[PDB]
Enzyme design. Structure first.
Site, PDB file in Angstrom:
ATOM      1  N   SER A 174      19.412 -40.592  23.486  1.00  0.00           N
ATOM      2  CA  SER A 174      20.044 -41.828  23.942  1.00  0.00           C
ATOM      3  C   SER A 174      21.575 -41.733  23.997  1.00  0.00           C
ATOM      4  O   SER A 174      22.119 -41.027  24.841  1.00  0.00           O
ATOM      5  CB  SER A 174      19.605 -42.984  23.032  1.00  0.00           C
ATOM      6  OG  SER A 174      19.983 -44.242  23.561  1.00  0.00           O
TER       7      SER A 174
ATOM      8  N   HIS B 167      10.448 -43.531  25.601  1.00  0.00           N
ATOM      9  CA  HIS B 167      11.850 -43.231  25.334  1.00  0.00           C
ATOM     10  C   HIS B 167      12.015 -42.258  24.167  1.00  0.00           C
ATOM     11  O   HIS B 167      12.872 -41.380  24.196  1.00  0.00           O
ATOM     12  CB  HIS B 167      12.606 -44.525  25.032  1.00  0.00           C
ATOM     13  CG  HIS B 167      14.054 -44.321  24.717  1.00  0.00           C
ATOM     14  ND1 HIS B 167      14.935 -43.744  25.605  1.00  0.00           N
ATOM     15  CD2 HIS B 167      14.778 -44.632  23.616  1.00  0.00           C
ATOM     16  CE1 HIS B 167      16.141 -43.711  25.068  1.00  0.00           C
ATOM     17  NE2 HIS B 167      16.072 -44.245  23.861  1.00  0.00           N
TER      18      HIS B 167
END
Lengths: 256, 256
Positions: free
Chosen positions: B79, B234
């Site tokens: 991220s 994710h």
């Protein structure tokens, strides 16, 4: 029936140890609170700021204080968490439907607070690669410790997966047993701690809280109910999660 | 071949996010370091003490500084970890064999440091139950945040088990993107960050770093190599751990 369980981790541990049991209990319809004690988990304090097992218990005591009149909870403590339970009970016995000991120390009211801890050190004297240090707080020399990774691997996470053991190496923090402080602490009371229902859960396959120690505690202070889980290891909330949840459900249906 | 991987978590996260990938990489013979960035995981600092993404990166920078001459590592960031990678590369490019981006921001050298972050906010404007606050440090107003539990459940841990999601609710801490600070920060350099090998790993099933954003980043700053993992979410280091390890092994055999 449904109950509000308050999960209490042991020293050097944090709420994270209950990451498997908490969702399972909720899947049974229960309300679950998993606290980080002082200087544990993501609590902002460092151990050098804590001067006693009572101060260490602050988050638990504060949580109980916040409970509206009439609301009771079932405390569940692992390893040294039993001491937090005793401290909390001498202050909020009326808010405790029952206390569940999970491979945990079982303090009594006839001997000083450090009694079972002193016995534990006798039965399990070698903590392997665990390291120790000292600091001063409120005029007392306190012995702090950091559980050794080999001790963790072999005696606590004995049968746990490498993914669980990894969390221990990444998250365990410095802590203390405040043993010398417990020794001089006023005895736990019969009216407070002595009056609560106590359920003792354990397994003879525990590699740190050995059978000799646990059976010794059961004989020393007779529990209201005893549950023995076959197999698993010291961390039953990880290796026997399902079994623990079932036992807690029965406790919920028995004590309120 | 074997390599020394340095795993870098995103804001509000900690080293614990890598508890599954780290042991797997070691099972392949690799050396693995999973750091807690400033005010993250069990780091003792609180976010209000941090004034920039650079200060936030301190633990990574200090780790690299401690590397003896000639020792190189492969950085892996998730991220927002890509920003830590860029900052580290402009200081220790010679110690970086390569950088691996795992559903991560990919800063460039032609636009200001906040460039891809500003783009991300445009593509994903609604952070749901995430809460925000402000504090002042070094004369600047910084916007802090705490990821919402619903956002975590639905967009980050989309396909993760409830046991993994629980760790997130228990361990995630307040953090910051230092967006306004990044905007005024000197551009990342072509000689430092621009010179390192960059491997971009992602999945089009990411519910927060959407395909539009990730494909936009790939076109904006062409990676040396691109790996697309099918399925998962994710948090591929949790849902596609094995796949990630295999990709990292290939990276280890390719860049040194």
């Amino acid at each position: 029936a449904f109950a509000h369980f308050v999960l209490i981790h042991t020293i050097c541990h944090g709420a994270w140890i209950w990451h498997k049991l908490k969702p399972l209990l909720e899947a049974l319809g229960h309300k679950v609170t998993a606290l980080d004690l002082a200087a544990s988990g993501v609590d902002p304090r460092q151990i050098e700021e804590i001067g006693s097992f009572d101060e260490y218990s602050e988050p638990l005591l504060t949580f109980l204080e916040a409970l509206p009149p009439g609301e009771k909870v079932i405390l569940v403590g692992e390893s040294c968490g039993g001491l937090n339970i005793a401290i909390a009970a001498d202050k909020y016995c009326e808010k405790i439907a029952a206390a569940v000991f999970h491979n945990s120390v079982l303090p009594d009211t006839e001997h000083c607070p450090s009694y079972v801890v002193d016995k534990l050190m006798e039965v399990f004297p070698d903590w392997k690669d665990t390291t120790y240090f000292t600091y001063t707080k409120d005029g007392k020399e306190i012995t702090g410790l950091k559980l050794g990774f080999t001790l963790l691997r072999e005696n606590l996470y004995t049968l746990c997966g490498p993914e669980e053991y990894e969390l221990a190496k990444m998250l365990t923090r410095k802590g203390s047993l405040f043993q010398n402080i417990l020794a001089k602490r006023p005895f736990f009371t019969k009216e407070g701690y002595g009056s609560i229902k106590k359920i003792y859960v354990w397994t003879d396959q525990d590699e740190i809280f050995l059978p000799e120690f646990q059976l010794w505690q059961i004989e020393n202070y007779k529990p209201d109910k005893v549950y023995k889980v076959e197999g698993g290891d010291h961390l039953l909330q990880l290796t026997k999660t399902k079994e623990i949840a079932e036992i807690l459900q029965e406790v919920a249906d028995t004590y309120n």
